[PDB]
Structure 1
Amino acid sequence: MRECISIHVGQAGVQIGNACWELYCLEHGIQPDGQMPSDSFNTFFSETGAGKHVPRAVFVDLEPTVIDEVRTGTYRQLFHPEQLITGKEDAANNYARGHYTIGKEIIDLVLDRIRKLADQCTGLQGFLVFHSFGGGTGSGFTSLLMERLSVDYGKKSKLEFSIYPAPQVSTAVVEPYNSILTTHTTLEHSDCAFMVDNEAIYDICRRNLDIERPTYTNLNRLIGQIVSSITASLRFDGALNVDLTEFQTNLVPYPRIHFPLATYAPVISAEKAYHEQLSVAEITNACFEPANQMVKCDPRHGKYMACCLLYRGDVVPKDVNAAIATIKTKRTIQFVDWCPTGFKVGINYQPPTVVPGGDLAKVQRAVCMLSNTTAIAEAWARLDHKFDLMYAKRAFVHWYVGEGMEEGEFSEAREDMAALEKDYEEVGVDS
């Protein structure tokens, strides 16, 4: 009965939602036609009198180039005609176009579709927003959608699945401006924000998964596996089930900090899991290694604050507790002094499912680790340094000012994140 609304915004949102709803359909045995060959599906698949299931997701994009691929491909008959909302002109990698001029005309249609989908939800848990920082739509439209959603719906949970710029490579030039201007806005109107990038998944898929030539589909399938392992507690039955409210409560101590890191174990191919033993100790010491996290930052520089572990499959709480005790005994992991009890555990019975033509092996047990750390301030300081080094010479400013905002928004957006950096060091100071 308990159900959540998925909102994917931007090209990243659409091409992640493709490989995510593929995994949802395969897990619940939902055909691409829309019919089940024959109530746990009701968390994502709403019934119809003809036995046909339609998802509780909203795809939004300001260009129809990828939505037409969705409407043309294998999953044409599954998604609703009105659950895929398109604009005529894209944001063209501009926060001003995303927030004030182009992103202002379709927000009424998007809000109407959200209200219509929420009216049929008997008990609603919250919203999960899939988007990217480096895009004009995925910054500006997501910012204004967050504003209007927070005004309309009061105390629903808001979780973010956010594609953050990689520290070395990226796909744009003005992504520091876009990142600064949307992270200034989404701080107040969000509850939790899982953060990912692309180079860390490239390194994972090269070192661990043994293909030297990856693709966005290979990235998106791992992201969809992580999202499914997050919502698996609501979907299926287990010894200890977690909820959206539960790991919103159990992961952030302060309202100004809502930035964890996501890690998944094990990642391995079909050739190697044939030989390597997959035990609870090894899958829980895989996560704590710095080479296996999906954000290019080293947790040895920082201090942990809270950790939430989600276990799926043939797992035993005795070995879970023994492995957690070994982790607590091992010294190189540091914790802040004001959190003596740092762990949350959730248990689910069903082992993960694999996709035909897939890359991951068919495993027995898996774990997803969501950990708040102070070692995101390093990456944020690098992005702030890039923002200052760009803003010193007033480059790329006329694009922003000629489409609706004034020039003081840049100053306010830098100063508030400087204050958040100060709050990061204040939290990281030992008592």
Structure 2
Amino acid sequence: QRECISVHVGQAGVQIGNACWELYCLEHGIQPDGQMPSDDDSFNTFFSETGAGKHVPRAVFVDLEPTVIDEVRTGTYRQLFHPEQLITGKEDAANNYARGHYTIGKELIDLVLDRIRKLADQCTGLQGFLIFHSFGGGTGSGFTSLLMERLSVDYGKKSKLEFSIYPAPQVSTAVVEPYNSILTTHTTLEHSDCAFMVDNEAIYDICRRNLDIERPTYTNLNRLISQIVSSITASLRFDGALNVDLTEFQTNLVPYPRIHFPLATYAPVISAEKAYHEQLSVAEITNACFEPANQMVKCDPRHGKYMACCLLYRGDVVPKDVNAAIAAIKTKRSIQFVDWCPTGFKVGINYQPPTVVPGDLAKVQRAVCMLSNTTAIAEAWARLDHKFDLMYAKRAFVHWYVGEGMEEGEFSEAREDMAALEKDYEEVGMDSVE
């Protein structure tokens, strides 16, 4: 009665998916074959017993290009995912939102919505639809938009979170990313609920400084994103003190209509050696989530004001120590906070200590995950705009989009609404002087 359908879309997705579902498994026991090595019903949030003792993941990996999903159809977890829940296609989407929301994407939509319906007609109480994608890619920005919109047509006002890889603040692995990103935000600004954002450059540093990994790859990063999906869903899988469901993150975060881009930040992300010298206490873990060097989205939260921050304490966290910490962070005049939000600190205290994947990160008996909606994400939208404009000015790399189904004009309407978004962050910022 607490199931959560997960639609992983794109390399990033299929890849964060591998990481996410490995943690999911090691947590409930489900071995890389389904058969749980028991000789109880918590697994239902993500798994679905067949009766023969096989637990099948409740997910729909979708990628217009093979390769990524195919390495999952021939690997350790090749017997867990039901073949028809790993829906690949034939041709890619060349980092072109156009061929993801119009041409080579509107063909896989029918089947994916189909599978999503069967994984819904078996749920006794769906909580939402956690969609994982990358703002910067064909399937990531294209299929998600189409999928999100078509979902809204069906599942109407049903929750639909969006863990995403926000464009980088300097690195970037594409030359057309800026475009796809602005186009995506536009088609999902009104169709998505609370889209969480994790920048890669950030995790890269958090892994070189806090997790002692000099040369981090996508897997080190992916596995940390899995710990975040755990805390966000921990309450509806393990017992705690202040449970937090997946319908409250839309209410206790998204303030006004458009604004819906919370940012992620994890706690006790230490590294063995540097854990033999740390009391990882509720306070330490919390103060850390508000340090402008851990925010997993390079966006110095100091150059902006907090709008709503929901903390999620997973582990041995005395309820009193939580109230104490939030108090201390409030006093600190460095951390700011808008006036229209006296109470801006939400708290969820579960009990299951963070799970240790045989790989990296320390065994902590306490850890928090903050999800604030800082107005300091405005810098990011401005940087994305500088980029979109530096190119749209010479209608560069637009032939490809008009070369699929995106009428030139759409590019304008998109950036124009992204400018509206920026003007919104200005209003939600200014404090009534009355």
The structural deviation recorded for 1:280 is 1.0
Which has the larger strand fraction? 1
The structural deviation recorded for 1:34 is 0.9
CA contact 2:304–2:374 (8 Å) conserved in 1: yes
The superposition leaves residues 137-178 of structure 1 with CA deviations (integer Å, 9 ceiling, x where unpaired) of 111111111110000111210101011111111110111111
Where 2:302 maps in the other structure, the secondary structure is: coil
Moved over 2 A (4+): none
The structural deviation recorded for 1:257 is 0.7
In 2: Cα distance, 1:47 partner to 1:349 partner: 25
The structural deviation recorded for 1:411 is 0.8
Identical columns (%): 98
Partner in structure 2 of residue 24 of structure 1: 24
The structural deviation recorded for 1:319 is 1.1
The superposition leaves residues 271-291 of structure 1 with CA deviations (integer Å, 9 ceiling, x where unpaired) of 221222111111111111000
The structural deviation recorded for 1:105 is 1.0
The structural deviation recorded for 1:247 is 1.8
In 2: Cα distance, 1:228 partner to 1:260 partner: 17
In 2: Cα distance, 1:314 partner to 1:403 partner: 53
In 2: Cα distance, 1:369 partner to 1:402 partner: 42
The structural deviation recorded for 1:323 is 1.2
The superposition leaves residues 207-246 of structure 1 with CA deviations (integer Å, 9 ceiling, x where unpaired) of 1111211111100000001110110011111111001111
Partner in structure 1 of residue 257 of structure 2: 255
Where 1:23 maps in the other structure, the secondary structure is: helix
Shifted more, 326-335 versus 127-136: the winner is 326-335
In 1: Cα distance, 2:68 partner to 2:282 partner: 40
The superposition leaves residues 18-61 of structure 1 with CA deviations (integer Å, 9 ceiling, x where unpaired) of 01100000000110011111111111111111111001100000
In 2: Cα distance, 1:213 partner to 1:402 partner: 39
Partner in structure 1 of residue 170 of structure 2: 168
In 1: Cα distance, 2:167 partner to 2:156 partner: 30
Partner in structure 1 of residue 347 of structure 2: 345
| Number of residue pairs the alignment of both structures matches | 430
The structural deviation recorded for 1:262 is 0.7
Where 1:263 maps in the other structure, the secondary structure is: strand
Where 2:367 maps in the other structure, the secondary structure is: strand
The structural deviation recorded for 1:248 is 1.3
In 2: Cα distance, 1:182 partner to 1:99 partner: 9
The structural deviation recorded for 1:335 is 0.9
Partner in structure 1 of residue 99 of structure 2: 97
In 2: Cα distance, 1:101 partner to 1:324 partner: 49
The structural deviation recorded for 1:329 is 1.4
In 2: Cα distance, 1:47 partner to 1:128 partner: 21
CA contact 2:3–2:127 (8 Å) conserved in 1: yes
Partner in structure 1 of residue 221 of structure 2: 219
The superposition leaves residues 360-417 of structure 1 with CA deviations (integer Å, 9 ceiling, x where unpaired) of 0111000011101100110110110111111111211111112112111011001111
In 2: Cα distance, 1:289 partner to 1:40 partner: 34
CA contact 2:243–2:348 (8 Å) conserved in 1: yes
The structural deviation recorded for 1:419 is 1.0
In 1: Cα distance, 2:272 partner to 2:114 partner: 45
In 1: Cα distance, 2:210 partner to 2:406 partner: 45
Where 1:312 maps in the other structure, the secondary structure is: strand
In 2: Cα distance, 1:322 partner to 1:18 partner: 37
In 2: Cα distance, 1:170 partner to 1:360 partner: 26
Normalised TM-score (structure 1):
0.99
In 2: Cα distance, 1:167 partner to 1:314 partner: 36
Aligned alpha-carbon RMSD (Å): 0.8
The structural deviation recorded for 1:341 is 0.8
In 1: Cα distance, 2:371 partner to 2:9 partner: 23
The structural deviation recorded for 1:331 is 1.0
Give the counterpart of 1:83 among 82, 85, 95. Answer: 85
Normalised TM-score (structure 2):
0.98
Partner in structure 2 of residue 128 of structure 1: 130
Alignment of 1:26-425 (within 5 A): 26-38=26-38, 39-356=41-358, 358-425=359-426
Q: Which runs of 5+ in 1 are unaligned?
A: none
CA contact 2:266–2:369 (8 Å) conserved in 1: yes
Shifted more, 272-281 versus 113-122: the winner is 272-281
CA contact 2:194–2:249 (8 Å) conserved in 1: no
In 2: Cα distance, 1:428 partner to 1:109 partner: 43
In 1: Cα distance, 2:213 partner to 2:424 partner: 41
The superposition leaves residues 73-130 of structure 1 with CA deviations (integer Å, 9 ceiling, x where unpaired) of 1000111010000110000111111111100111111111111111011111110000
Where 2:156 maps in the other structure, the secondary structure is: coil
In 1: Cα distance, 2:257 partner to 2:290 partner: 26
Where 1:67 maps in the other structure, the secondary structure is: helix
The structural deviation recorded for 1:326 is 1.1
The structural deviation recorded for 1:181 is 0.9
The structural deviation recorded for 1:318 is 1.1
Q: Which runs of 5+ in 2 are unaligned?
A: none
In 2: Cα distance, 1:127 partner to 1:309 partner: 21
The superposition leaves residues 321-343 of structure 1 with CA deviations (integer Å, 9 ceiling, x where unpaired) of 11111111111111111111111
In 2: Cα distance, 1:403 partner to 1:151 partner: 24
